[PDB]
Design a protein around this nucleic acid. Structure first.
Ligand SMILES: [Mg+2]
Ligand SMILES: [Mg+2]
Ligand SMILES: [Mg+2]
Ligand SMILES: [Mg+2]
Ligand SMILES: [Mg+2]
Ligand SMILES: [Mg+2]
Ligand SMILES: [Mg+2]
Ligand SMILES: [Mg+2]
Ligand SMILES: [Mg+2]
Ligand SMILES: [Mg+2]
Ligand SMILES: [Mg+2]
Ligand SMILES: [Mg+2]
Ligand SMILES: [Mg+2]
Ligand SMILES: [Mg+2]
Ligand SMILES: [Mg+2]
Ligand SMILES: [Mg+2]
Ligand SMILES: [Mg+2]
Ligand SMILES: [Mg+2]
Ligand SMILES: [Mg+2]
Ligand SMILES: [Mg+2]
Ligand SMILES: [Mg+2]
Ligand SMILES: [Mg+2]
Ligand SMILES: [Mg+2]
Ligand SMILES: [Mg+2]
Ligand SMILES: [Mg+2]
Ligand SMILES: [Mg+2]
Ligand SMILES: [Mg+2]
Ligand SMILES: [Mg+2]
Ligand SMILES: [Mg+2]
Ligand SMILES: [Mg+2]
Ligand SMILES: [Mg+2]
Ligand SMILES: [Mg+2]
Ligand SMILES: [Mg+2]
Ligand SMILES: [Mg+2]
Ligand SMILES: [Mg+2]
Ligand SMILES: [Mg+2]
Ligand SMILES: [Mg+2]
Ligand SMILES: [Mg+2]
Ligand SMILES: [Mg+2]
Ligand SMILES: [Mg+2]
Ligand SMILES: [Mg+2]
Ligand SMILES: [Mg+2]
Ligand SMILES: [Mg+2]
Ligand SMILES: [Mg+2]
Ligand SMILES: [Mg+2]
Ligand SMILES: [Mg+2]
Ligand SMILES: [Mg+2]
Ligand SMILES: [Mg+2]
Ligand SMILES: [Mg+2]
Ligand SMILES: [Mg+2]
Ligand SMILES: [Mg+2]
Ligand SMILES: [Mg+2]
Ligand SMILES: [Mg+2]
Ligand SMILES: [Mg+2]
Ligand SMILES: [Mg+2]
Ligand SMILES: [Mg+2]
Ligand SMILES: [Mg+2]
Ligand SMILES: [Mg+2]
Ligand SMILES: [Mg+2]
Ligand SMILES: [Mg+2]
Ligand SMILES: [Mg+2]
Ligand SMILES: [Mg+2]
Ligand SMILES: [Mg+2]
Ligand SMILES: [Mg+2]
Ligand SMILES: [Mg+2]
Ligand SMILES: [Mg+2]
Ligand SMILES: [Mg+2]
Ligand SMILES: [Mg+2]
Ligand SMILES: [Mg+2]
Ligand SMILES: [Mg+2]
Ligand SMILES: [Mg+2]
Ligand SMILES: [Mg+2]
Ligand SMILES: [Mg+2]
Ligand SMILES: [Mg+2]
Ligand SMILES: [Mg+2]
Ligand SMILES: [Mg+2]
Ligand SMILES: [Mg+2]
Ligand SMILES: [Mg+2]
Ligand SMILES: [Mg+2]
Ligand SMILES: [Mg+2]
Ligand SMILES: [Mg+2]
Ligand SMILES: [Mg+2]
Ligand SMILES: [Mg+2]
Ligand SMILES: [Mg+2]
Ligand SMILES: [Mg+2]
Ligand SMILES: [Mg+2]
Ligand SMILES: [Mg+2]
Ligand SMILES: [Mg+2]
Ligand SMILES: [Mg+2]
Ligand SMILES: [Mg+2]
Ligand SMILES: [Mg+2]
Ligand SMILES: [Mg+2]
Ligand SMILES: [Mg+2]
Ligand SMILES: [Mg+2]
Lengths: 74, 55, 136
RNA sequence: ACCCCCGUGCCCAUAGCACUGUGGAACCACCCCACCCCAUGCCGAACUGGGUCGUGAAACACAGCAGCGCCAAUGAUACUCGGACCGCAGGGUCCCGGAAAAGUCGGUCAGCGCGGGGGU
RNA sequence: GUUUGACUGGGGCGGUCGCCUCCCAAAAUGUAACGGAGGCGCCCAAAGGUCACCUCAAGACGGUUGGAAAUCGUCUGUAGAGCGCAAAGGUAGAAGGUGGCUUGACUGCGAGACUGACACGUCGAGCAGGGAGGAAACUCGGGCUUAGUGAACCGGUGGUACCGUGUGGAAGGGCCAUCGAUCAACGGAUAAAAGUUACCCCGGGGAUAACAGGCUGAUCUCCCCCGAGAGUCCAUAUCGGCGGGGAGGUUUGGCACCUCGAUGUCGGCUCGUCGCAUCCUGGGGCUGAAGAAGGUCCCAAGGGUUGGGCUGUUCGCCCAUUAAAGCGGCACGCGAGCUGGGUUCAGAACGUCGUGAGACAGUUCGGUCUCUAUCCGCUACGGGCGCAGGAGAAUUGAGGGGAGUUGCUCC
RNA sequence: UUCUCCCCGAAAUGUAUUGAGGUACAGCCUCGGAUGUUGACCAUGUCCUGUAGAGCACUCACAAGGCUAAAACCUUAUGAAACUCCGAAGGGGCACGCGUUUAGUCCGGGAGUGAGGCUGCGAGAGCUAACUUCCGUAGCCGAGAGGGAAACAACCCAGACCAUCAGCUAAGGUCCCUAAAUGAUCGCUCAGUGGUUAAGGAUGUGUCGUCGCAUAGACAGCCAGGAGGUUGGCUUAGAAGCAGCCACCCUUCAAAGAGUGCGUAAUAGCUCACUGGUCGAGUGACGAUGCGCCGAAAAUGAUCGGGGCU
């Protein structure tokens, strides 16, 4: 009635204004606190990862619906 | 922008210590002449209780 | 007194109260000055005193309520299994919080009734009539 | 160039709801019919296929309006990085910057593109 | 011959040991407790691929069985539902509810990243072979995610044709699939294992219990505030509900700080000495104090505080007295001072428990208490020097010790 | 577990363990090589977060009313580790240096450490106990001498290369023991408070406010007075101002209230409120604070370190 618990690191991993290489993981989350943006892909656990290299950037609108996205260099 | 140490590093937190070390002061009674550019103003503000800022 | 409710046990610390600094109901009000827990029978003794002095008449409101469980380990054991399942319910009380307030009783009799009730509370406390008030 | 309609985006409640008024032969809408393309775990109600008329009834479009939502200051306070203290303790104070939540004043019933249709 | 886990506010009994979710966790991640709550060791050939369509809970009014909730109809209706199991995030342009065809619940790979001491674990664009659904863009290498798990060794089965001891074979082995793990103590000592010791031994520990001391003061003891009532009447002569605040440190305890290269433990005896919260005596107030005899509170620690029966007892009950038969501290004072009755060694017995060896909350008869005091402290007794000459006597008293109780009768 | 001086200098954490006072890996130390400012601090830009606070919009809890077949629903009103319409200060990543400093990283040889301790802040367990226990965070001890804190690892100041019968300062101090003003000014407490807690209690005292009564002559003193209904109704055996229950109405006045306290089972009796004379100026009740008072009893001899200080 006490002994139990468990430890699974989660969170944003690549924050806005950072230069991700493509295939980088940018957020680990359990649901859709972030929705995959333009240039972003989301795997089974709703991880968001770079589709192509660029500047990571965040779009915030109402915390029901914000999105991570890539603005490529060049 | 004259400065000197007038209180020891010892027994003071880490940022205060490394900041004293950045400003160029390594002994009480050291003095120095520092430019007024924002980051140096921020350093000499961060540890202003250790320093007798001249004016 | 005891609530009919939810999770058995809790924690504890403090900061000045917000949820009732002003006397809405009634005329006069006794009011806490210190941050103790108040809990159950302490209040109920306040209630039974004032109801003796006043009843057949007056309106008695108890704006405070034994929300918070508090625990006692058994008897005499070492720091052992878990915490102790029961013991008494309390109400945290911060200064400016209003515990009591009478209605339909003359100023002086409310003085004497607040005096009796406050002679059995862990905190010292001060009474007041309601100044001008806002918050509606 | 002015007007309005049909689509369609950016922005997605300061742009939403309620009460109200205005539109029909431009446009949209209801509407008529349906054995079949097609289709409802029963019903062409909805998808669907052929078309007037009629009617803007409902819908939709536009306009009014601040009852409701939504936005939301200033003053101050809570709390607090840092600095220095008190109380035996619960707990409290001071100087220095940072600074809410709520609530009051007020603000709104949007704003900005692309096209195509039809008016003048 | 051996085995007979670990954690553990001493050990044992109990509980726990891997994995998921939330709080603790101090707005990054991480973070302990025998902290607070709850779940997993599965499930689904469709609850999966894809492709098409539908939208929930709840309420109100109205209606056949009904009669709060069934079924049907209108209205309101960011979700108050649903999502196979827990909870959390997420979710209505669905991940929810239904139908169509289907297996991508793929083979060979893997840019680049999350996470871990390692070994593990997670996500993943994109390339080829070949498919599935869609008209198409395109989506598919199991499931809305997060638990449904097990290294290695040793082996069962099916492919493959690497090895194969002179040569060609075959036996045997290897490579690719795959079967065998409450190895749950869940990073898993052997393929294979329980007890007991009071007959006990060794190495260690004050890293850790029993005594005592310490810290604390829940429990214990004691005192104060209020004043409901009792006291015929009157709260406070006495008593004082329900509640509040303190003191002490003598109880049981918590904690584990010095002592495990030893700080001897119950009770008695002996010897004392201290506190005062005073049993007696002494002085006071008040009284529901006429006197007498009392009640209770205040001052007061000089002295005093009996002898027996029972029991190891401390206590406590009793006998017969008393002015009184006080309560505590002093390592629960005092074993290099005595007992040794009590409990903690070996024998033996009963009751009980254990198949046993043995055990105890026990009960019972028996059972080695170490001639020489170095220092300090104490009681007594001398020697030396000093006390401005050397001698014999008499002495002041700075200061210090002892003593200090009480009845009875009579006027 | 033995000879010297010189340079640097840790660990008592993490995960695993028939593991727990052992050991492996990592972490932190040192040495040599390589790079060669990538390190540190502080600033601006940008992004992330749900704590402090707050709030009831959901879940649970919950206080007084309204409507009502109680549920919902309206006004008023609260609590929250496992609630959140909101939500800071701070904190983390990245870039840049717009600016100061001096480390950082990679490679290879040698390690030790894996028993920690205290305090402040943030929590849990515990009594909001412990020189308590388990985490987080800062600093000291550990391995830190020196000055202060009587004495005292940890608290305050400050990091000891060697010499000096030179100087300046920190915390902390300036009557004597003791270096240094028996200093200066405006105050406060007469308790040795200072130099030992609280509920509670009190005309201690100094400072401020808020209220009333008044010199057309008030507060306390003194003389005179103290109503008739009515033994107000119930009440009880009796309760007549005064055991307890319903009110507090009229006549007169300058006027004495079905009325405050003592008395007696009940009465009576004595005084109270309000009204006069003579005084004769302040007086009375609340409330905030400064410093003091009581509340305040343990054991071998006392004391603030001592003398002693108003
Ligand atoms: Mg400091
Ligand atoms: Mg507080
Ligand atoms: Mg505060
Ligand atoms: Mg409020
Ligand atoms: Mg349109
Ligand atoms: Mg309309
Ligand atoms: Mg026309
Ligand atoms: Mg039709
Ligand atoms: Mg119309
Ligand atoms: Mg402001
Ligand atoms: Mg600052
Ligand atoms: Mg601070
Ligand atoms: Mg401020
Ligand atoms: Mg606001
Ligand atoms: Mg409009
Ligand atoms: Mg146009
Ligand atoms: Mg052997
Ligand atoms: Mg063990
Ligand atoms: Mg259990
Ligand atoms: Mg965190
Ligand atoms: Mg944090
Ligand atoms: Mg830890
Ligand atoms: Mg807990
Ligand atoms: Mg779907
Ligand atoms: Mg096809
Ligand atoms: Mg793929
Ligand atoms: Mg084979
Ligand atoms: Mg051969
Ligand atoms: Mg073969
Ligand atoms: Mg293990
Ligand atoms: Mg094995
Ligand atoms: Mg075994
Ligand atoms: Mg025997
Ligand atoms: Mg033998
Ligand atoms: Mg031994
Ligand atoms: Mg030893
Ligand atoms: Mg110890
Ligand atoms: Mg141990
Ligand atoms: Mg012993
Ligand atoms: Mg004991
Ligand atoms: Mg002990
Ligand atoms: Mg000892
Ligand atoms: Mg008590
Ligand atoms: Mg003890
Ligand atoms: Mg310890
Ligand atoms: Mg010894
Ligand atoms: Mg013993
Ligand atoms: Mg006495
Ligand atoms: Mg006497
Ligand atoms: Mg007498
Ligand atoms: Mg006797
Ligand atoms: Mg005999
Ligand atoms: Mg004695
Ligand atoms: Mg004892
Ligand atoms: Mg003894
Ligand atoms: Mg002996
Ligand atoms: Mg014996
Ligand atoms: Mg038997
Ligand atoms: Mg014999
Ligand atoms: Mg014997
Ligand atoms: Mg001899
Ligand atoms: Mg002579
Ligand atoms: Mg003498
Ligand atoms: Mg002498
Ligand atoms: Mg060094
Ligand atoms: Mg592990
Ligand atoms: Mg270890
Ligand atoms: Mg190592
Ligand atoms: Mg090097
Ligand atoms: Mg770098
Ligand atoms: Mg740099
Ligand atoms: Mg809070
Ligand atoms: Mg708002
Ligand atoms: Mg530079
Ligand atoms: Mg190495
Ligand atoms: Mg070497
Ligand atoms: Mg350790
Ligand atoms: Mg630690
Ligand atoms: Mg607790
Ligand atoms: Mg400790
Ligand atoms: Mg050490
Ligand atoms: Mg030192
Ligand atoms: Mg150090
Ligand atoms: Mg020192
Ligand atoms: Mg000293
Ligand atoms: Mg001291
Ligand atoms: Mg110490
Ligand atoms: Mg030392
Ligand atoms: Mg000087
Ligand atoms: Mg000074
Ligand atoms: Mg001097
Ligand atoms: Mg002076
Ligand atoms: Mg007081
Ligand atoms: Mg007087």
């Amino acid at each position: 009635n006490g002994r139990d618990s468990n430890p699974k690191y989660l969170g944003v991993k690549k924050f806005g204004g950072e230069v991700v290489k493509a295939g980088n993981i940018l957020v680990r989350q359990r649901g859709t606190k972030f929705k995959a943006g333009q240039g972003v892909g989301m795997g089974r656990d709703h991880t968001l990862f770079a589709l192509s290299d660029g500047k990571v950037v965040f779009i915030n609108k109402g915390k029901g619906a914000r999105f991570i996205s890539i603005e490529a260099a060049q | 922008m004259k400065i000197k140490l007038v209180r020891s590093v010892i027994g003071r937190p880490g940022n205060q210590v490394k900041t004293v070390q950045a400003l160029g002061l390594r002994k009480i009674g050291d003095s120095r002449e520092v430019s007024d550019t924002p980051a140096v103003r921020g350093m000499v503000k961060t540890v202003k209780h250790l320093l007798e800022v001249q004016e | 007194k005891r609530t009919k409710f939810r999770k058995q046990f809790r924690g504890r610390m403090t900061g000045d109260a917000k949820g009732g600094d002003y006397v809405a109901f009634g005329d006069y009000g006794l009011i806490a000055m210190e941050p103790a827990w108040i809990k159950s029978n302490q209040i109920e003794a306040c209630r039974i005193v004032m109801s003796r002095h006043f009843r057949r008449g007056g309106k008695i409101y108890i704006r405070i309520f034994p929300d918070k469980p508090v625990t006692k380990k058994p008897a005499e054991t070492r720091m052992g299994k878990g915490k102790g399942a029961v013991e008494y319910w309390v109400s945290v009380v911060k200064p400016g919080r209003v515990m009591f307030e009478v209605a339909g009783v003359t100023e002086e009799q409310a003085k004497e009734a607040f005096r009796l009730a406050g002679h059995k509370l862990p905190i010292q406390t001060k009474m007041v009539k309601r100044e001008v008030y806002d918050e509606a």
